[PDB]
Ligand binder design. Sequence first.
Ligand code: K
Ligand code: K
Ligand code: K
Ligand code: K
Ligand code: K
Ligand code: K
Ligand code: K
Ligand code: K
Ligand code: K
Ligand code: K
Ligand code: K
Ligand code: K
Ligand code: K
Ligand code: K
Ligand code: K
Ligand code: K
Ligand code: K
Ligand code: K
Ligand code: K
Ligand code: K
Ligand code: K
Ligand code: K
Ligand code: K
Ligand code: K
Ligand code: K
Ligand code: K
Ligand code: K
Ligand code: K
Ligand code: K
Ligand code: K
Ligand code: K
Ligand code: K
Ligand code: K
Ligand code: MG
Ligand code: MG
Ligand code: MG
Ligand code: MG
Ligand code: MG
Ligand code: MG
Ligand code: MG
Ligand code: MG
Ligand code: MG
Ligand code: MG
Ligand code: MG
Ligand code: MG
Ligand code: MG
Ligand code: MG
Ligand code: MG
Ligand code: MG
Ligand code: MG
Ligand code: MG
Ligand code: MG
Ligand code: MG
Ligand code: MG
Ligand code: MG
Ligand code: MG
Ligand code: MG
Ligand code: MG
Ligand code: MG
Ligand code: MG
Ligand code: MG
Ligand code: MG
Ligand code: MG
Ligand code: MG
Ligand code: MG
Ligand code: MG
Ligand code: MG
Ligand code: MG
Ligand code: MG
Ligand code: MG
Ligand code: MG
Ligand code: MG
Ligand code: MG
Ligand code: MG
Ligand code: MG
Ligand code: MG
Ligand code: MG
Ligand code: MG
Ligand code: MG
Ligand code: MG
Ligand code: MG
Ligand code: MG
Ligand code: MG
Ligand code: MG
Ligand code: MG
Ligand code: MG
Ligand code: MG
Ligand code: MG
Ligand code: MG
Ligand code: MG
Ligand code: MG
Ligand code: MG
Ligand code: MG
Ligand code: MG
Ligand code: MG
Ligand code: MG
Ligand code: MG
Ligand code: MG
Ligand code: MG
Ligand code: MG
Ligand code: MG
Ligand code: MG
Ligand code: MG
Ligand code: MG
Ligand code: MG
Ligand code: MG
Ligand code: MG
Ligand code: MG
Ligand code: MG
Ligand code: MG
Ligand code: MG
Ligand code: MG
Ligand code: MG
Ligand code: MG
Ligand code: MG
Ligand code: MG
Ligand code: MG
Ligand code: MG
Ligand code: MG
Ligand code: MG
Ligand code: MG
Ligand code: MG
Ligand code: MG
Ligand code: MG
Ligand code: MG
Length: 251
Amino acid sequence: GRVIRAQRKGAGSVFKSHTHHRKGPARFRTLDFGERNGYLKGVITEVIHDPGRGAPLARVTFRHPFRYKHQKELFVAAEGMYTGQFVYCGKKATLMVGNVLPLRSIPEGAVVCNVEHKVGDRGVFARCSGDYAIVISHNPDNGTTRVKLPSGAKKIVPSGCRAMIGQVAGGGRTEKPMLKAGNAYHKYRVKRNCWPKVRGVAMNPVEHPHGGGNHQHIGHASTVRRDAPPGQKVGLIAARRTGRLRGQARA
RNA sequence: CCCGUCUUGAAACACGGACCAAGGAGUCUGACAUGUGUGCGAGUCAACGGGCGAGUAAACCCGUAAGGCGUAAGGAAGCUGAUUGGUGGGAUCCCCCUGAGGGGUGCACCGCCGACCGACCUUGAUCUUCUGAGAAGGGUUCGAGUGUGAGCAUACCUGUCGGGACCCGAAAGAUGGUGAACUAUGCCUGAGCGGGGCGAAGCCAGAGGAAACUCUGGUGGAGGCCCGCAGCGAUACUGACGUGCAAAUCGUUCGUCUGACUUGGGUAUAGGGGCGAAAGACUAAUCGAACCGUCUAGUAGCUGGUUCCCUCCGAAGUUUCCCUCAGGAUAGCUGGAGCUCGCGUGCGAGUUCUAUCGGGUAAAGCCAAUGAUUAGAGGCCUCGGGGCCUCGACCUAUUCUCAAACUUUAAAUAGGUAGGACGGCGCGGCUGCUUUGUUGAGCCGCGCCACGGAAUCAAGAGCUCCAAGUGGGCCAUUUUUGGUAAGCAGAACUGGCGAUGCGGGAUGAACCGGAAGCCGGGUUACGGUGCCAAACUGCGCGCUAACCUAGAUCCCA
RNA sequence: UCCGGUGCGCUCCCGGCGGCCCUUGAAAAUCCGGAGGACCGAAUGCCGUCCACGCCCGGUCGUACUCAUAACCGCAUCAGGUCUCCAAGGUGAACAGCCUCUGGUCGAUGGAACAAUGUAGGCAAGGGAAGUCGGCAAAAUGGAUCCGUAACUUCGGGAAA
RNA sequence: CCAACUCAGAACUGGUACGGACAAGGGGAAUCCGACUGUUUAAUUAAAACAAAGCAUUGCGAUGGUCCCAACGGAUGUUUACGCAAUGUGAUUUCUGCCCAGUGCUCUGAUGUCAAAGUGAAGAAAUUCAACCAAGCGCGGGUAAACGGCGGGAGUAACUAUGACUCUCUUAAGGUAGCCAAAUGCCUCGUCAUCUAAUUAGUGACGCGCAUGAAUGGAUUAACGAGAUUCCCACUGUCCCUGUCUACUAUCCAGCGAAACCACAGCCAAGGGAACGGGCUUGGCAGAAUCAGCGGGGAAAGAAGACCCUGUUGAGCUUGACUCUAGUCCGACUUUGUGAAAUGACGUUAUUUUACUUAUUCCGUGAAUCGGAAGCGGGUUUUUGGACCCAAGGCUCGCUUCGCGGGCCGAUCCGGGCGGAAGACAUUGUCAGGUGGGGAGUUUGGCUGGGGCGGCACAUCUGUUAAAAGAUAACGCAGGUGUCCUAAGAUGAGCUCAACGAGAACAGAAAUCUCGUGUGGAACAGAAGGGUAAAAGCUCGUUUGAUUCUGAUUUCCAGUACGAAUACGAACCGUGAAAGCGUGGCCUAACGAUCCUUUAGACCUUCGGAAUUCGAAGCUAGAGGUGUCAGAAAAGUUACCACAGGGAUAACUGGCUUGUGGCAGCCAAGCGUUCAUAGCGACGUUGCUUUUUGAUCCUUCGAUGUCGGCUCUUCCUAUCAUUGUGAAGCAGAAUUCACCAAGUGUUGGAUUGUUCACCCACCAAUAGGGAACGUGAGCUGGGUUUAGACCGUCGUGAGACAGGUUAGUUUUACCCUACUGAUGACAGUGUCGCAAUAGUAAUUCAACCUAGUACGAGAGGAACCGUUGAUUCACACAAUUGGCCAUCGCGCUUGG
Ligand SMILES: [K+]
Ligand SMILES: [K+]
Ligand SMILES: [K+]
Ligand SMILES: [K+]
Ligand SMILES: [K+]
Ligand SMILES: [K+]
Ligand SMILES: [K+]
Ligand SMILES: [K+]
Ligand SMILES: [K+]
Ligand SMILES: [K+]
Ligand SMILES: [K+]
Ligand SMILES: [K+]
Ligand SMILES: [K+]
Ligand SMILES: [K+]
Ligand SMILES: [K+]
Ligand SMILES: [K+]
Ligand SMILES: [K+]
Ligand SMILES: [K+]
Ligand SMILES: [K+]
Ligand SMILES: [K+]
Ligand SMILES: [K+]
Ligand SMILES: [K+]
Ligand SMILES: [K+]
Ligand SMILES: [K+]
Ligand SMILES: [K+]
Ligand SMILES: [K+]
Ligand SMILES: [K+]
Ligand SMILES: [K+]
Ligand SMILES: [K+]
Ligand SMILES: [K+]
Ligand SMILES: [K+]
Ligand SMILES: [K+]
Ligand SMILES: [K+]
Ligand SMILES: [Mg+2]
Ligand SMILES: [Mg+2]
Ligand SMILES: [Mg+2]
Ligand SMILES: [Mg+2]
Ligand SMILES: [Mg+2]
Ligand SMILES: [Mg+2]
Ligand SMILES: [Mg+2]
Ligand SMILES: [Mg+2]
Ligand SMILES: [Mg+2]
Ligand SMILES: [Mg+2]
Ligand SMILES: [Mg+2]
Ligand SMILES: [Mg+2]
Ligand SMILES: [Mg+2]
Ligand SMILES: [Mg+2]
Ligand SMILES: [Mg+2]
Ligand SMILES: [Mg+2]
Ligand SMILES: [Mg+2]
Ligand SMILES: [Mg+2]
Ligand SMILES: [Mg+2]
Ligand SMILES: [Mg+2]
Ligand SMILES: [Mg+2]
Ligand SMILES: [Mg+2]
Ligand SMILES: [Mg+2]
Ligand SMILES: [Mg+2]
Ligand SMILES: [Mg+2]
Ligand SMILES: [Mg+2]
Ligand SMILES: [Mg+2]
Ligand SMILES: [Mg+2]
Ligand SMILES: [Mg+2]
Ligand SMILES: [Mg+2]
Ligand SMILES: [Mg+2]
Ligand SMILES: [Mg+2]
Ligand SMILES: [Mg+2]
Ligand SMILES: [Mg+2]
Ligand SMILES: [Mg+2]
Ligand SMILES: [Mg+2]
Ligand SMILES: [Mg+2]
Ligand SMILES: [Mg+2]
Ligand SMILES: [Mg+2]
Ligand SMILES: [Mg+2]
Ligand SMILES: [Mg+2]
Ligand SMILES: [Mg+2]
Ligand SMILES: [Mg+2]
Ligand SMILES: [Mg+2]
Ligand SMILES: [Mg+2]
Ligand SMILES: [Mg+2]
Ligand SMILES: [Mg+2]
Ligand SMILES: [Mg+2]
Ligand SMILES: [Mg+2]
Ligand SMILES: [Mg+2]
Ligand SMILES: [Mg+2]
Ligand SMILES: [Mg+2]
Ligand SMILES: [Mg+2]
Ligand SMILES: [Mg+2]
Ligand SMILES: [Mg+2]
Ligand SMILES: [Mg+2]
Ligand SMILES: [Mg+2]
Ligand SMILES: [Mg+2]
Ligand SMILES: [Mg+2]
Ligand SMILES: [Mg+2]
Ligand SMILES: [Mg+2]
Ligand SMILES: [Mg+2]
Ligand SMILES: [Mg+2]
Ligand SMILES: [Mg+2]
Ligand SMILES: [Mg+2]
Ligand SMILES: [Mg+2]
Ligand SMILES: [Mg+2]
Ligand SMILES: [Mg+2]
Ligand SMILES: [Mg+2]
Ligand SMILES: [Mg+2]
Ligand SMILES: [Mg+2]
Ligand SMILES: [Mg+2]
Ligand SMILES: [Mg+2]
Ligand SMILES: [Mg+2]
Ligand SMILES: [Mg+2]
Ligand SMILES: [Mg+2]
Ligand SMILES: [Mg+2]
Ligand SMILES: [Mg+2]
Ligand SMILES: [Mg+2]
Ligand SMILES: [Mg+2]
Ligand SMILES: [Mg+2]
Ligand SMILES: [Mg+2]
Ligand SMILES: [Mg+2]
Ligand SMILES: [Mg+2]
Ligand SMILES: [Mg+2]
Ligand SMILES: [Mg+2]
Ligand SMILES: [Mg+2]
Ligand SMILES: [Mg+2]
Ligand SMILES: [Mg+2]
Ligand SMILES: [Mg+2]
Ligand SMILES: [Mg+2]
Ligand SMILES: [Mg+2]
């Protein structure tokens, strides 16, 4: 046999991300004294499109805390943000869509996005268009907070983690059908070299476990175990179940 | 009939070979072995080295407790370690005698039987340091032993084996390198793409309506939309070409043509890796694993080739074992080397004779067992069958026909043994075996006898060493299995071909004759004598008349 | 070496508007402008000056020619392959085809005959696929204007029916 | 006053010509497949294959999923579930049934099995034992849009037929909705309808469907297609049936000028022969040199057959093959320190939970207000798309003074942690166990009337083949063997069996008992053969010779081993009064080396510095096994394929044979109203043929191009028609049988790739065959038979299918010969002739007349002669008609 397609991606080469026209990483300010204790005011200058990213981005200008200069930032735009709007980041920032607050200051039931996992990591959760996290409860004793992630999982994060109030703008993107291979071509042209996909059963045995045979068929269970080595781990990896998700399974 | 070649079989419609020159294939080396030559000999070897020396890679000299091989073997080992020959044949010589003679001598070699050393077993008087010594006495056991050494060095042929290993030849495997100037895909930066057709949303005007909204005309120019130029691509003619213009082109005809579009340059991915809208595609005319060098003269039970002359001898396709069936080893067949003897008194023979022994095929047998099988006849006692009758069972004597796996009997052919000096007789002796018993058994000594104890032949007999080739067979008379049969397949005895020409069968590997140095003469074999074509249209009798191509010679058509 | 006209004309450049995207379509050198006003002259001679004019200076390497039916690659002076710029008149919807001007060129070894077979291009009485595996090949249709246009349909088409 | 070019209409006019050249859709009715656009095997496959939007499933919350990496690290990721990664299906519309037993995947963790380390015990110790003991496996649950699967028999309703219904075996579930002789149906050219004059085709139906079926997606579907298929209209040189025109070749010349190929060569018939000769045998024959063509032959060239087989050659691929491996999971030790508590074991000490931060790991930043304590406030910036830096001010020293330079406040103090998280876990290193076709290496017997499948003829016994010693083959024939037995072994004694006859309550064909006859007709473990009667059989008694130690011999055979057997010797025993017998089974089969392991035996030998005791190593004899049985450790596939070879061996022709196929004869039971033989020929029996198929394997594997059709010639006769005749159950007409006879002819079509077949139609007739199953350098390429692709069945899979389907490069002649024509030669030259010999050709039908005649009850119904035409064929020819034009002859006409 030869190295299968799934194995060739890890080496990089022609499978690296297409990032030539990207505007840069979108993240909160670096945690500093101003945000830990009070609040810092910023102004939205423009809402821009980032190739490969559905969610729009917002350029925000801040006054540097101790240097005579402007401080430029790039935030994942929340639904409702507009140019010329004042954005407040810090512990004492008011609860309004667009402001960035620590989870400690956000009451239960609030909708937040770009939630930090580690205090100061500048945002890792709920960053895609139309996605958000829901604050469940606070634990003053442990100093931790419970939030519901877009996938429906509940996670414990320290109360110092920051989050932007509101949901990510651009929601409803995936509802529209593409209708065309060309539209998919343009979508993935600015993401990475992952499209089109050739089915394993259409290949020869040399390059895929599903290949070969006088009929197109897998010939063995497509569910493969977790510990299968690379090149053997194709199909439904460590599937707890298969088939149509009916009843409580699709909850 | 063309050579070479594999082959049961080649002039072959089996392969190599257009022609000439030159080159072109059993070698070198290590080990061992038999044989032969040479030296010395219970020894032998100058081999590492030293002393020297043709001013010198030679030659010459040196082995003082060197070393190798030999001089002693047996045992796993601890250990022990050759008491030193008897006999039947036999070369040569000596004496007598002049016989296929009789005595003495008895080497080499062979047969037979003891003894000695050791492993194993067995045995133990008398001693001893308690485990040893050994008076005597052993064994269907075992040994590459002993019983007055034969080795060592060296030369060369041949043979086995390792190596490039007679020469040339794989598909592969490994190692280390080089390519993305083609092509595949991503990325960066540029460039390129007539004229037409359809007429989406939005917009204007008019008309209808209670409203909702509806209708008509225009405007507008949407789209992996249509026709189509360039570009890109490549469907058909299965057209041309097919030693081409071209290792993919040419002609006409075709697909697509604002997009998943086309294209330049830059840049990234490298060989079990890349890349792949996926054809195992593509990765520089190379891809179901590229290219280059090396390992490498890779290995081949397989194909091809393998170089002068005469002379002599001269095969095998069979046995056993083998992951053995295209191979190998083994035995047989063969050559070379001899050696031991012998000269007709031969002790030999693919032959017979005499005497004697075994056999179960051919035939025969069923009126003999076992099995198969036809018909009547008598008795009809007793059993069943049916209607006293009656058929069949039964019993007796007969009768037709049979057998590779039936048989009383039983050939032909073939098989075994014997026909003297290794015989016989007489008198003695030995024994632990044997017997009631010097009774037997075998052996030993002495003496005597033994015209060779059927025929024929005997270009003689015996013994050993080393080694080649071969281990595909085929044909025929006869016996014979499978098969309808076969120029089919498989066995038995012999011959033949293969390896072999020559005369005859027109022609033919096998049929008939017959086997061969180079010639002259003579005569034949098989076959022939009208011509072809050497020899009669010879001398005799009969048969045949074919208007079907009358008929015309084993195998044989 | 002069005086005018004309345009859904062609090539290039620019302007402005609109359509399209789950596609929004580089960077840096360099240059310009701005906010701020530390510091600085003169009592009028100094200071400042991106103004005008005058004066001086200008490295290294490439530069011929072909760019292709003969200068590149394909073993060749090979009907193949190889990026791009300029683009006249007529016919016509048209950088279609056909003809012409500028420029280029007659470079493909020549001569004589006019058999078969061939290759390429044609035509054909009457019949009209009977040919053949099969309408292969060829023929027929073709532009434009007007009229007219079915089944079916995802209502968009089908349709140049 | 100046304007450009679009549209509409009218008159006139030409031989109805006018998009006049150029340019430039054929159209329609349907089936199959794929939605579409797109992409694909550069140089044989453009497609139904790939992709696609849509749909569905799976993993993953960063201490992560997937992947790369020798290591360090890295890709996804400038990312964060509307995301990334891994799969299947394949627009829309309608749907997507049942099965979790099997194979996977997965969840769970009082519970068997389960490694190293560690722990305990015993021992002089090496070591041994026990306990404890991770993951995994096992056990239990889930999961089919995971791999996949989804059934038989019999009865049964007012004619039959059918089976709602009932009975019964049974599965994890028994194929549901649909669909179908389908690109899926063997039978099959299925049945019915439709299309045609005729249809193996097409379409629509029917369905117990060899072997349909639901995201291995089922059923549909507008639009689209250089995709497969059928029909209709138009159109035509595709054809009937060829003809002709132009150009360039060929041809001839000047100049220039190769190559393939070549044993020698080149006329035939038959024969024999390696079974298909240019050479040989016997014949026919045979006359210099040369030109243009031609494809019969040279089993022509091109290439050490790619098919098939063999080899102790490979390679790609697969997996339930053997042996391994990266990775990954898991445990121990290490990194690795500081505490506490609970519990447990013996001041130490295990286990569990938890605390500490400095090791270690991670996150953030241009390391920019961290920790503590004070002041202050109570119980520092948020209507606005501006601006924000380098300190004002106060206090206080120096001062080379009203100007410079410092200090402290403004701007709290203190703290030797840049900020945060996890934390002795994780991580790293080492070993241990599990998993591991992701990956590596390798294997995948032999015999064989080719190989495979089957079988075992591979070790092995009896009878026979086997030809009266021995030996003797086949995938010959009929059978047997891998065991069984403390007796079924040994020995002694007594007894006699099978069967039959005649007798005895129940009792009979057959229970038990009595007498008689009884050569074995019984029994003796098993196959068969042989052998045995006071026994080798049967019943009893005593017993272990089924024992120990060698050697020898036989069978096999190389005169090796093994197995088996036999005769002795030396011991110890059994049995019998004793002789004697007994070393397994009455005899002929019933079995196994080296190495290794294990056991038994010998107050045995060695552990090499000397000893002792363990342990180990030897000597002798057995046991654990190799059945491919003289004894490797071993699964597939290749249609992507490779190499060495093989005509030692298959797939053609030819050759032998002729069972089978085809054709023919003899006898005469019977049929034929009567009547064996006009015409037939049962039961038997004798042949021929090589146009059937088999059998064989002789020729060819350094290659003889492998179906059919087309085209073209020749040959055969076993005669379909035509000429001449005989026979009849021959009145006529028609028909049948037979004779001479191969001169002439034997056709046009639908369906099928076909050969074959079948139908329609015509005809005098629509006979049968050969020539390497004639004929591919003659064509064609539909089929078969490479590589792409689809279905069904089969297989875990790679893949397989004398199953279906669709797309798939057909090369070379100029050599010799043959044949066709062309010059020349043939003794000066020319004209006119003769002539051997060879070739050869004509053919069939119809009408009229005979004649409504002969004949016949009637129906019906001929023929010769003669006349006039026609068919097939042949050889010529162009007056006429028709065809061809570059007469480039004349005219017309488009664009320039
Ligand atoms: K690989
Ligand atoms: K891609
Ligand atoms: K796909
Ligand atoms: K498969
Ligand atoms: K040969
Ligand atoms: K041969
Ligand atoms: K030859
Ligand atoms: K010396
Ligand atoms: K010993
Ligand atoms: K050698
Ligand atoms: K490679
Ligand atoms: K071999
Ligand atoms: K007899
Ligand atoms: K008898
Ligand atoms: K041999
Ligand atoms: K220049
Ligand atoms: K060129
Ligand atoms: K037709
Ligand atoms: K397109
Ligand atoms: K699936
Ligand atoms: K299941
Ligand atoms: K299951
Ligand atoms: K197509
Ligand atoms: K010339
Ligand atoms: K391969
Ligand atoms: K740790
Ligand atoms: K594996
Ligand atoms: K007895
Ligand atoms: K064997
Ligand atoms: K026959
Ligand atoms: K062949
Ligand atoms: K030919
Ligand atoms: K095609
Ligand atoms: Mg997809
Ligand atoms: Mg494929
Ligand atoms: Mg695989
Ligand atoms: Mg042969
Ligand atoms: Mg020869
Ligand atoms: Mg021949
Ligand atoms: Mg050969
Ligand atoms: Mg040759
Ligand atoms: Mg020479
Ligand atoms: Mg010495
Ligand atoms: Mg001793
Ligand atoms: Mg060599
Ligand atoms: Mg290998
Ligand atoms: Mg490139
Ligand atoms: Mg388009
Ligand atoms: Mg188009
Ligand atoms: Mg269209
Ligand atoms: Mg062609
Ligand atoms: Mg084609
Ligand atoms: Mg030319
Ligand atoms: Mg790599
Ligand atoms: Mg591509
Ligand atoms: Mg393939
Ligand atoms: Mg190389
Ligand atoms: Mg063996
Ligand atoms: Mg050979
Ligand atoms: Mg016999
Ligand atoms: Mg007999
Ligand atoms: Mg007889
Ligand atoms: Mg041989
Ligand atoms: Mg021979
Ligand atoms: Mg003859
Ligand atoms: Mg005469
Ligand atoms: Mg140019
Ligand atoms: Mg115009
Ligand atoms: Mg033009
Ligand atoms: Mg015509
Ligand atoms: Mg006409
Ligand atoms: Mg017509
Ligand atoms: Mg056509
Ligand atoms: Mg239509
Ligand atoms: Mg398509
Ligand atoms: Mg392509
Ligand atoms: Mg191709
Ligand atoms: Mg093609
Ligand atoms: Mg769908
Ligand atoms: Mg690492
Ligand atoms: Mg579909
Ligand atoms: Mg389902
Ligand atoms: Mg279960
Ligand atoms: Mg343990
Ligand atoms: Mg466990
Ligand atoms: Mg059904
Ligand atoms: Mg069906
Ligand atoms: Mg039909
Ligand atoms: Mg038809
Ligand atoms: Mg369907
Ligand atoms: Mg449709
Ligand atoms: Mg297309
Ligand atoms: Mg001839
Ligand atoms: Mg010849
Ligand atoms: Mg020829
Ligand atoms: Mg020719
Ligand atoms: Mg070959
Ligand atoms: Mg070959
Ligand atoms: Mg081999
Ligand atoms: Mg072999
Ligand atoms: Mg291999
Ligand atoms: Mg493997
Ligand atoms: Mg075999
Ligand atoms: Mg066979
Ligand atoms: Mg005999
Ligand atoms: Mg015998
Ligand atoms: Mg007995
Ligand atoms: Mg015995
Ligand atoms: Mg006694
Ligand atoms: Mg026995
Ligand atoms: Mg044994
Ligand atoms: Mg020692
Ligand atoms: Mg054997
Ligand atoms: Mg043969
Ligand atoms: Mg030929
Ligand atoms: Mg005749
Ligand atoms: Mg009559
Ligand atoms: Mg005839
Ligand atoms: Mg047809
Ligand atoms: Mg024939
Ligand atoms: Mg033929
Ligand atoms: Mg031919
Ligand atoms: Mg051909
Ligand atoms: Mg043919
Ligand atoms: Mg074909």
